[PDB]
Structure formats: C-alpha cells, structure tokens
Amino acid sequence: NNSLEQKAEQVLAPLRLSKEKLQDLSKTFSDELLRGLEMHKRHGLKWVPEECSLRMLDSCVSEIPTGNEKGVFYALDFGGTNVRAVRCELLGGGRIRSQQFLKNLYECGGEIDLMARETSASQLFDVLAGCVGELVEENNEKELLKKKAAKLGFTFSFPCVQRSLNNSVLESWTKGFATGHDTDDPVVGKDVVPLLAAAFARQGLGLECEAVVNDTVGTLLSCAYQKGPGGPPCTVGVILGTGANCCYWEPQAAAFGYRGAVVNVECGNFNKNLPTTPADEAIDNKSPNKKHQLFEKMISGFYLGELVRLLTLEIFGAAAPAKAREEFSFDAKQAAVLAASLMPGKEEDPALASSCKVLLKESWGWDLDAAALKVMRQIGFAVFDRSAALAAVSIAVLVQRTRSLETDGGVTVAVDGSLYVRNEWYGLRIRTFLKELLGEKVDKVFLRAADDGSGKGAAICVAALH
C-alpha cells in the first residue's frame, strides 16, 4: 500500500487513452483502411502485409435484407468441432423463428476421427450434411425439399480464399483439424461448396448452398433483417467476444475491385500507432502468433484477463498472490467483475466491491485488504475501458467510411460477442468514446445487439438473394 497507489497510477496511466490519442488512432486507422482498399485494387486475393495490416477481404455480399423477406432458409455453421445446423423461418416484419441441431465432431463417426489426417473430405462433409439432414428430418421436410430445394448459407470459419459468394477454397486448417491431409480426397485447396453439395446429394437432401458467409458479415445481416423494414441502415457489423473483428458497407467497393459491397476488415491485425504498454508486449511475446492480431490483443476477451494479471504482477510486486504467476489464471469474466464495480455511478456501491473481494479469494486465494482491493478494481476498470475505447475507434472509422450518416442521416451498428452481450456497461462505455470521437452526431449512431451471425446471419444472406 501507500506507494502502491503511486505505482498503480504510473502503470495504469498509459491505459487511459485521452480524446486526442483516440482521435489520432482514428486517423491512423482510417488511413490504413484506405491503404487496404488500394491494396485490394492492385492485388486482389493476395494479402500484402507490407502494404496494409488489414486484409480487407471481399465478403462477396451485396444484397442487404429489407426485413420483409419470407420463407424457410437453412444454415450450416462449421467453425470448429461444435457444428450447428440452423433452420430459420423468416416471417417478415423482421421476425425470425429458429431451430438448431448440434453435432460434436469428437463424438461423431464410428471408429473414425473426423479431425484426423486419414479422414477424407467426403467423410467429414457426410457428417456436416447429416447434421443439416437431421434438422430437415425433425421438420418432416425431406420430401418437400426433394420437390423444391431450400437455400442454405454456409459459415465456414477457417482461412479461405473466396472468389465469389458461393466459391471458397480452404487455404489451411486451424483449430486442431487435419482432415484429408493423408488422402486423395483433401479439403485443403478445394472449394468447399462442391464438397458440401456432393454430400447433400449422397443423402438425397434438397439444399442448395448459395453463399459462404463470414460470421461478422452474418452479424451485420442478422441485424439488417431483424431491426425490421425502415430505420437507419445497418452498414457496420462488429464482434467483440473472445476475438474481435468488424465489417462494413463500402460505398466505392466496385472501384476498388470488390464483387461484394461488404468488406471483412479483419481489424484484429491492425498494428499501426497502437498505444502499446509493457503488458501488451509481454502478451504478444509469449503468444503463438507473435506480431499478429495486436489490436485484438488489446481488445478481446481472450486477452483482457491476461492483461489484468500482468498489470497485477507489475503493480503489486512481491505482494502479488502466487496464482497470479500462472498464465490464464484470470479470465475476462473475472476482469468484468472488477471493471463493473467502477462503472459510472457504481464506484461506492458496496455489493459490487464485495463481489470483487470474493472473486479474488476464489480465483487467486488472495485475502487482500481494502486498499489492495481498490487498486485491483482500478486495474480491471482500466483494461476494460481501454477495450471499449479501442472498439469505439474501430466503429467510428467504419461509420465514417460507410458515409451512412451523410447519405441516410443515421447508421445502425450491429454488435455481437460476449464482451458486449454479457456486460451492459460495455456498450455504454463504447458510446461515451464514440461521442468523444464523433461529436453530437453520435446521436445518429445506433448500436444494436445482433444475434447468431454464423447461423441466422448465413440463412438471411441467402434469403436476400431472391
């Protein structure tokens, strides 16, 4: 204590980004976005990191829903071992009724590891197609779809090369997958849409995959449909969860060589003029993706707990608890408990502070005193508030680029992700920083929660084509 507060001040001040620092970062990010569009115009599918840290991927999505579309549309959500099939009744007026069927690929296939190098593409896609087929059968719909096929959107959350809305080639596996590597039937290097269509045909399923949809773009589309007809257009989509990403509607997309209008920025990798602190350097240095995802490493839930832990070690020194020396011993949910205790008009609320005391005892075995508890709360607040401020920078830059404020007098920003969904104050802090960045015209910016981009959003994508 006593000089604990001076040390906390010295360590935490670089995390408190002033309006001027946020405005400078916004300018840097805007310039980088333009560099990325010029990069796309010249290089197309080839990312040139030396020209731009933002991939600026063509989502190939051009048709934004009105909210009036009606019908039954399907989606397949394959982003790892937890596969989902989704069926959406679009009822008009922004209303959607959904069903889902879940498959855990670890427990699928008899004496066959679907993630293994010896498994063929056909075996994996048979299981994916069968997930959708189980949902079709729950609805007693197989014969109806034999008569008239249903449209399906495919969220395939792996590194891909996407030449058109319905053509996406797997560039390399991630997330522990190796399927097909040791077979004559690979997934890597193949367009996944014909693999899925072949699997549907083998099971007699009348589903036509018309889009491979990025989940951030799906979040934008989910919002666009479900806010209903009318209102300021949804031209920005943001995911603030375990990771962080954003997409937006680009008014000069055609001139820069895009087929779609919605650009998937891949802003997690933004790396220009970042307000780096020693804790950020430590997080990057021990990560498996050094010098990549540097913006995300300051924003997203995967890292906020690590930031609190490393700043705790830095500030408390020999007074830090032993468990704070263990990587990933403190997560973003726990950091949020700390940050919530210091949100506007809650600082002297005793119940929130008491939850903090219990938290630190349970997670770190730390029976700390009043002054130490106050400093821990300040650490958690500083980490989460910086996350909100940097998210606000991303949103403001994208809103400016859409020109929606100028052409439609308002903009709807679709937001999803655990940081925003779990913490009511997080979006409010985003709005405070958006006011700092944009002035009074933040009153024309509407943040709207948007659900299930990877499922609902992909079904909406294909519904908007017709």
UniProtKB/TrEMBL annotation:
It comes from the Eukaryota. The lineage of its organism: Eukaryota, Sar, Alveolata, Apicomplexa, Conoidasida. Pathway: Carbohydrate degradation; glycolysis; D-glyceraldehyde 3-phosphate and glycerone phosphate from D-glucose: step 1/4; Carbohydrate metabolism; hexose metabolism. GO terms for cellular component: cytosol; mitochondrion. PANTHER family: HEXOKINASE, HEXOKINASE TYPE 1-RELATED. Residues 236-463 form the Hexokinase C-terminal domain. Gene3D superfamilies: 3.30.420.40, 3.40.367.20. This is Phosphotransferase. GO terms for molecular function: ATP binding; D-glucose binding; fructokinase activity; glucokinase activity. It comes from Eimeria tenella (Coccidian parasite). Its EC number is 2.7.1.-.
